[PDB]
C-alpha cells in the first residue's frame, strides 16, 4: 500500500509499505529516502505519536493515509 509522510516544511514524502510493517520499519524506510537517522524521528498519526513496536494496522493506518514527521530535540 501507499502512505505519505508530511514534514513541517510542507514536503510530502511517499512510502511503499505493508500494513504489517512496524513503526521501526517506516522510520527505516524514511531514513533511506530522506537520509534521517530513525532515532531522531517522531511520527504522528491523528494527533498521536507512533511507537516503534506497533505496526501500521495497530493504529488503523491504511493506504492514502498521512503520517506526520517531527525531528526530535534531545533536551535534558
Amino acid at each position: 500500500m501507499q502512505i505519505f509522510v508530511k514534514t513541517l516544511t510542507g514536503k510530502t514524502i511517499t512510502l511503499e509499505v505493508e500494513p504489517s510493517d512496524t513503526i521501526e520499519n517506516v522510520k527505516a524506510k524514511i531514513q533511506d529516502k530522506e537520509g534521517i537517522p530513525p532515532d531522531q524521528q517522531r511520527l504522528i498519526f491523528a494527533g498521536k505519536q507512533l511507537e516503534d513496536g506497533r505496526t501500521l494496522s495497530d493504529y488503523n493506518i491504511q493506504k492514502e493515509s498521512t503520517l506526520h514527521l517531527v525531528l526530535r530535540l534531545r533536551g535534558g
Binding site: T7, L8, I44, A46, G47, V70, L71, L73, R74
Partner: protein, 375 residues
C-alpha cells in the same frame, strides 16, 4: 539621527564584564552542532560567561582565526535552530522565507521552552559579539522584542490574504455571514476549534463587535498562542543585551542588527563584477585577483570587501544589486598605476585600482599590505 550612529552608541553602552574569563570555550562537532551547542551554552548558569571572547573549535580543528570560526558557528547553528523540522520555528506562509514561532512547539518537543531560551542566548551572543544570525523573522517578532503592540497592519507583510479578509470585515457588515468568535486550525491530521473568548462558539460577529473580533484574531495569530515561547527567547536574549538599551532601535534597525550574512559568496561576487581600463574576466591579473580572493579565509575576504566598499556587511540579493554612495554602483576593478604602487580603493564607487602585477604572489602581498595599512 541614523543607524550607524545608534550602533556605535549601542556597542559603546554595552558593559564589558570584568568578573569573567578572557575566553568562552566551545568544543563542537558539525554533525551535532545543535545538541553540542545547546548543552554547552545551556550548561552555564551565568550568561555573563558568554560575553567572553568566543573560542570555538569544530571537530578538533586548531590554529584557525577565532572570528572566522565564530562566524561559521553562527551560520551553522542558525541553520539548525531555525530548521522547521524541529517544530520550534516555521515559515510564515507558503513560498515565504521569514520565520515565525510555531505556536504548537510544545507538541513537537516538550523541551521547546529551554531551546527557545537557547536560541535567545545565541541571538544575544550574536549581537554582543557583533556577528549575525542567518535567517529573518516576521516583523511582529521584532516588534514583540521591542515590546510594541501588534495591530492589523502588521498582518499585511506576513499574511496578505488574512489581512485582506480582515480588511473586508472591517469595511463591511458581516452580520449575515453568521461568523462566530472562533477559529479553526488543522494540526497533524486533525482540526481544532479555538475560542477567541469565553463562549466564542456562540457569539456572532456583527458590525458592533467586529472591531473586537479583529483585534482578537490578530493577538491569537501573533501573540497569545506563542506567549511562553517568546518569553523564553526574550529571557535568553536579554541576558546579554539589556532590554532597555535595544529600545533605541525600530523593528527595521533591529532586524539589521541581528540578522544577515557573515561571509560573501565568491562565485556571486565574481559574476557581478565589472572591469575598467583594459581588464576583463579573462585578463591574467584578474584571474590572479579572483584566485587570491578564493584562497583568502573568511576574515580576509571581508577585510577586502570593507577596503573597497567601506562597509563589511554584504547586501542581500547578492552583488547584482550592489549600491554605491550615489545609486547602484557595481563592484569594479580597474587597471591603474605601476607594480611599484599599492592598490587603492574608492569606496564611493566600490572600485579597486589594481596595478598590473607580474605574479600572483606579488598581487597577494601588495593587496594584503594595502588592506593592512588602512586598518
Amino acid at each position: 539621527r541614523d543607524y550607524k550612529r545608534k550602533y556605535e552608541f549601542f556597542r559603546r553602552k554595552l558593559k564589558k564584564q570584568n568578573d569573567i574569563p578572557n575566553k568562552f570555550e566551545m568544543k563542537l562537532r558539525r554533525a551535532t552542532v545543535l545538541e553540542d551547542s545547546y548543552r554547552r551554552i545551556m550548561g552555564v548558569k551565568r550568561a555573563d560567561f558568554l560575553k567572553a571572547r568566543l573560542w570555538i573549535e569544530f571537530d578538533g580543528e586548531k590554529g584557525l582565526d577565532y572570528g572566522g570560526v565564530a562566524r561559521e558557528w553562527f551560520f551553522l547553528i542558525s541553520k539548525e535552530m531555525f530548521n522547521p523540522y524541529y517544530g520550534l520555528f516555521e515559515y510564515s506562509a507558503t513560498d515565504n522565507y521569514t520565520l515565525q514561532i510555531n505556536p504548537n512547539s510544545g507538541l513537537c518537543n516538550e523541551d521547546h521552552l529551554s531551546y527557545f531560551k537557547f536560541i535567545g542566548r545565541v541571538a544575544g551572543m550574536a549581537v554582543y559579539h557583533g556577528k549575525l544570525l542567518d535567517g529573518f523573522f516576521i516583523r511582529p517578532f521584532y516588534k514583540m522584542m521591542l515590546h510594541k503592540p501588534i495591530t492589523l497592519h502588521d498582518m499585511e507583510s506576513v499574511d496578505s490574504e488574512y489581512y485582506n479578509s480582515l480588511r473586508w470585515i472591517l469595511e463591511n457588515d458581516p452580520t449575515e455571514l453568521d461568523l462566530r468568535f472562533i477559529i479553526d486550525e488543522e494540526l497533524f491530521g486533525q482540526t481544532h476549534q479555538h475560542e477567541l473568548k469565553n463562549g466564542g462558539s456562540e457569539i456572532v460577529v456583527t458590525n458592533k463587535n467586529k472591531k473586537e473580533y479583529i483585534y482578537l484574531v490578530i493577538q491569537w495569530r501573533f501573540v497569545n498562542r506563542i506567549q511562553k515561547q517568546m518569553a523564553a527567547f526574550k529571557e535568553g536574549f536579554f541576558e546579554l543585551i539589556p532590554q532597555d538599551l535595544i529600545k533605541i532601535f525600530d523593528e527595521n534597525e533591529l532586524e539589521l542588527l541581528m540578522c544577515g550574512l557573515g561571509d560573501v559568496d565568491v562565485n556571486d561576487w565574481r559574476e557581478h563584477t565589472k572591469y575598467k581600463n583594459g581588464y576583463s574576466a579573462n585578463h591574467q591579473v584578474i584571474q590572479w585577483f579572483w584566485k587570491a580572493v578564493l584562497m583568502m579565509d573568511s576574515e580576509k575576504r571581508i577585510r577586502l570587501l570593507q577596503f573597497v566598499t567601506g562597509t563589511s556587511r554584504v547586501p542581500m540579493n547578492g552583488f547584482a544589486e550592489l549600491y554605491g554612495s550615489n545609486g547602484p554602483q557595481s563592484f569594479t576593478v580597474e587597471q591603474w598605476g605601476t607594480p611599484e604602487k599599492l592598490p587603492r580603493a574608492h569606496t564611493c564607487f566600490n572600485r579597486l585600482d589594481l596595478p598590473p602585477y607580474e605574479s600572483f604572489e606579488e598581487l597577494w602581498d601588495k593587496l594584503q599590505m594595502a588592506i593592512e595599512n588602512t586598518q
